[PDB]
Design an enzyme around this catalytic site. Structure first.
Site, short mmCIF file in Angstrom:
data_model
loop_
_atom_site.label_atom_id
_atom_site.label_comp_id
_atom_site.label_asym_id
_atom_site.label_seq_id
_atom_site.Cartn_x
_atom_site.Cartn_y
_atom_site.Cartn_z
N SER A 99 0.82 -1.19 0.00
CA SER A 99 0.00 0.00 0.00
C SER A 99 0.86 1.25 0.00
O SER A 99 1.75 1.54 -0.80
CB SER A 99 -1.01 0.02 1.17
OG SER A 99 -2.24 0.58 0.72
N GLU A 112 -8.33 -5.64 -5.32
CA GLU A 112 -7.77 -4.47 -4.73
C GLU A 112 -8.82 -3.48 -4.24
O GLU A 112 -8.59 -2.80 -3.26
CB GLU A 112 -6.84 -3.78 -5.74
CG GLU A 112 -5.56 -4.55 -6.00
CD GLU A 112 -4.57 -4.51 -4.84
OE1 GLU A 112 -4.77 -3.75 -3.86
OE2 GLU A 112 -3.56 -5.27 -4.92
N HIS A 133 -7.29 -6.15 -0.35
CA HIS A 133 -6.09 -5.39 -0.05
C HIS A 133 -5.40 -5.80 1.26
O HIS A 133 -5.99 -5.81 2.31
CB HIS A 133 -6.49 -3.92 0.07
CG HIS A 133 -5.35 -2.97 0.00
ND1 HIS A 133 -4.62 -2.76 -1.16
CD2 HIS A 133 -4.82 -2.16 0.94
CE1 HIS A 133 -3.69 -1.86 -0.93
NE2 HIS A 133 -3.78 -1.48 0.33
#
Lengths: 530, 537
Positions: free
Chosen positions: A200, A325, A438
């Protein structure tokens, strides 16, 4: 008196702790200060090197988490709480952690440096999923992780000033890198083989170290998991950073840059945190008020300019994404989504959701997105619209920026390896419709399934072992493939063949074109609509 | 007729204008009756050029209706002399402005009871075509399915479509009016041949399909038929119509190009020009380099077409209409060899990506730079963006989709959404006897010979499977003509052909294999063409 928990670094002596990993013991040195505490007048300022200490510093416990917003959307829910601070908050938080094998390595050992994510507003190196003991024990790795300032404390900027120049969270990270260069050899680490890895905002950070010249002399290899320095969320312009800083200043009663910053320094941390979300322009998921700023110093230009014009000849990079995602961010402010429903939505909701997830799209661009992602055999089906909303956010914020980064890097000299992570953790507590969300590859990379008391399947703990040796092989050689090895080879990503691999329980599968058409839509067509 | 008593009493028929005698032709399975070269209009010559057709005034005696009449005056293709692929579409009778004749095929002897009528409207871009072509031979449908089949000549090119909208010497759409007059002729006279005026199905290919579509959208025509088949063409889309202003502009330009300067003035001067002069200049008028684009086409005149075809299909009520629509697999291929740099019937037409960009500019000449690059990006293969085969095939698909496939998808959608029973197909079989290069796949218009049943003629060298296929298609089409449903009402064994709906979007593949049902007629791409691209202007 265990002598291989006693280590001398440039600032003095430290005492670590012998930790138990499933296969045996490891040495851990936790809460090592690498900077002067960035409190009082040092708030918003670049970090200063830690002054030397007397005696033996206790390095057996995690230090405080950098002051930040704490998520309360689903109180007590594992899926969210696993990412929340697990130590107390403080502005006095610039400490790092070192995991090594026990006993300390015989020969110089490749170093992995973890930079956590959390949107530049949150995160901590002390989280359970970032535990270095498994990589250290099983692969014999030296692993370092640092805390860096987030939110306003880390990224509030009034560009041009010297009290708040911006990017100080990145400077925290860089100072930690310098610390590793100067001291990691005392732990058995090799300062000449350093690999940065992060997920990230951490992946974006890694990217920014790639694109900043002073950082370049502090590492040799890089891993960017589900994040990039380029893209719509990772950076802001100097003007916009100024605007947001000034707005936050007025929201907390402040009031000349010097005056304003001094007033901000008088404010308690929690006031700043309380107002940090009330400054951002548009309604938006995947978008954060205080992020790295294109300052013409740390970032000499925009990340996309720098990746377009850069020479990356002597760089090896490993990049990738998870299967879903966008799913995680839908439950955080898109009307119709929740962790409790299956989040089926109407097409009106889908249009609106596109407007939210893609806020600085014009009406025409937004419609282009809508049309592009609609399945015209089922343009009204709520499941298809949900999945489409997810794909819009994911592709726009991660997958296509990653595809572009990989393309530029490969085209301009870098050795690149690309993956898509597709296994959903058996222990995952998020709803099934969110797929592989994610950040849920991390626990596998760090080897958490090797702990029997965590209730992973057996295949998941072989899978975990595979990923650990992919990542450590890459650290060791710049190549994820096992140098003497049977599984299919992981080919480099190139602009010609565009090869990447699927990471899941089945053996490596080589595919071609990382969402090539869709990312051609995002990276080639849609920019022309402005 | 002094010799009636010595002649075949089964070939003498009376119509409104007098008596005619046809000819007994031999079809593979038996004889058929053919009545060829029947005048349905006064010859549109001299002062009648550019004018609406006048009904044929009655004649004395027995009209010889045993041979095809003249072909309407038109450009003749000579790009590949002696090549079957082009020559099969060229005129097979002499050219004349005196060309308004029609043809009727029936069983021999003529049907006992009223029989559903099929009326063929030929294609050819509104600049060419003839009802007398071999590929439009009605004898097979008449013999095998017992059909009554009518095909008419209509004026093409300037003679048919040159318009100065508002004028009364050249009002436009007169070729469509020729078609309509023939439709009326059928209504009044077909019963004398054993045809049923209360069951009339129009069918046509290319410009003929567009013509059929226009009869659907024009009220006077609506009382002249009951069902419609549109093969690889639509009244909507980029090529089938022009605005009044643009038609005026083009007529004026052609006039000036042939030495002609008040509408009356100008039209009279044009009427003094020899037919061939008009043909020679008709191509020198259109704006840009254009494949699939013609100078003189139906005009949105606010009369025959009360509004744009798109407007009319968007606001129309079609609930008592049954329609059969479809496309071939490679609608664009044939047009690439006609003016896109890099394409030929003799090489494999591999092209560069620069050539691809240029070709997109030519095939979509209305499109702005942005729209053009949108097209290019959409059709690019991002794993192999330089591959010449893929770029060739992509160029083909751009032209086909833009001009045929997506206009069809739109039409089918609007019709189904507004009450019509629609059946949709894609035709995928490549004729074994096809002389166009293999890379062109199943080109435009090469389903026709199968529909008409030409493979039943042993001397044409089709395979056996092709003859069975042909029989299947003839039965589909005639079943549709008979019932509004291509399915055989008592065949339990064979796969069903489901209606096209906006919900399921079902259509069938037509090939040597049994019916296969698919969903979404190039749905994503046609959403790009029909929904997104218009918004970029």
């Amino acid at each position: 008196e265990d002598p291989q928990l006693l280590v001398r670094v440039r600032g003095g002596q430290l005492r670590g702790i012998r930790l138990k990993a499933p296969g045996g013991p490891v040495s851990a040195f936790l809460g090592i200060p690498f900077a002067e505490p960035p409190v009082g007048s040092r708030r918003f300022m670049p970090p200063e090197p830690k002054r030397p200490w007397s005696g033996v510093l206790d390095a057996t416990t995690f230090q405080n988490v950098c002051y930040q917003y704490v998520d309360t959307l689903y109180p007590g829910f594992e899926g969210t709480e696993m990412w929340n601070p697990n130590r107390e908050l403080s502005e006095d938080c610039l400490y790092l952690n070192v995991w090594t094998p026990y006993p300390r390595p015989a020969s110089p050992t490749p170093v992995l440096i973890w930079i956590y994510g959390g949107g530049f507003y949150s995160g901590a190196a002390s989280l359970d999923v970032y535990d270095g003991r498994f990589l250290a024990q099983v692969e014999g790795a030296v692993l370092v992780s640092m805390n860096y300032r987030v939110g306003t404390f880390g990224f509030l900027a009034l560009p041009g000033s010297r009290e708040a120049p911006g990017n100080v969270g990145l400077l925290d990270q860089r100072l930690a890198l310098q610390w590793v260069q100067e001291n990691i050899a005392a732990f058995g680490g090799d300062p000449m083989s350093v690999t940065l890895f992060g997920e990230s905002a951490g992946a974006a950070s890694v990217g920014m170290h790639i694109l900043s010249l002073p950082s370049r002399s502090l590492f040799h290899r890089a891993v960017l998991q589900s994040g990039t320095p380029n893209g719509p969320w990772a950076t802001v312009s100097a003007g916009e950073a100024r605007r947001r800083a000034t707005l936050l200043a007025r929201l907390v009663g402040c009031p000349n840059d010097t005056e304003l910053i001094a007033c901000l320094r008088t404010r308690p941390a929690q006031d700043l945190v309380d107002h940090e979300w009330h400054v951002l322009p548009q309604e938006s998921i995947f978008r954060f008020s205080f992020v790295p700023v294109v300052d013409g110093d740390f970032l000499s230009d925009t990340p996309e300019a720098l990746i377009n014009t850069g020479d990356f000849q002597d760089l090896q990079v490993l990049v990738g994404v998870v299967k879903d995602e966008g799913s995680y961010f839908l439950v955080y402010g898109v009307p119709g989504f929740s962790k409790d429903n299956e989040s089926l939505i109407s097409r009106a909701q889908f249009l609106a959701g596109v407007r939210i997830g893609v806020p600085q799209a014009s009406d025409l661009a937004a419609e282009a997105v809508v049309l592009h992602y609609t399945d015209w055999l089922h343009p009204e089906d709520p499941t298809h619209l949900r999945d489409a909303m997810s794909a819009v956010v994911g592709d726009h914020n991660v997958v296509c920026p990653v595809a572009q980064l990989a393309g530029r890097l490969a085209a301009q000299g870098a050795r690149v390896y690309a993956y898509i992570f597709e296994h959903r953790a058996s222990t995952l507590t998020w709803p099934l419709w969110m797929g592989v969300p994610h950040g849920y590859e991390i626990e596998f990379i760090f080897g958490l399934p090797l702990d029997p008391s965590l209730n992973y399947t057996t295949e998941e703990r072989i899978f975990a072992q595979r990923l650990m040796k992919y990542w450590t092989n890459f650290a060791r050689t710049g190549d994820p493939n096992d140098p003497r090895d049977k599984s299919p080879q992981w080919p480099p990503y190139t602009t010609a063949a565009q090869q990447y691999v699927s990471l899941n329980l089945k053996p490596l599968e080589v595919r071609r074109g990382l969402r090539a058409q869709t990312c051609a839509f995002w990276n080639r067509f849609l920019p022309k609509l402005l």
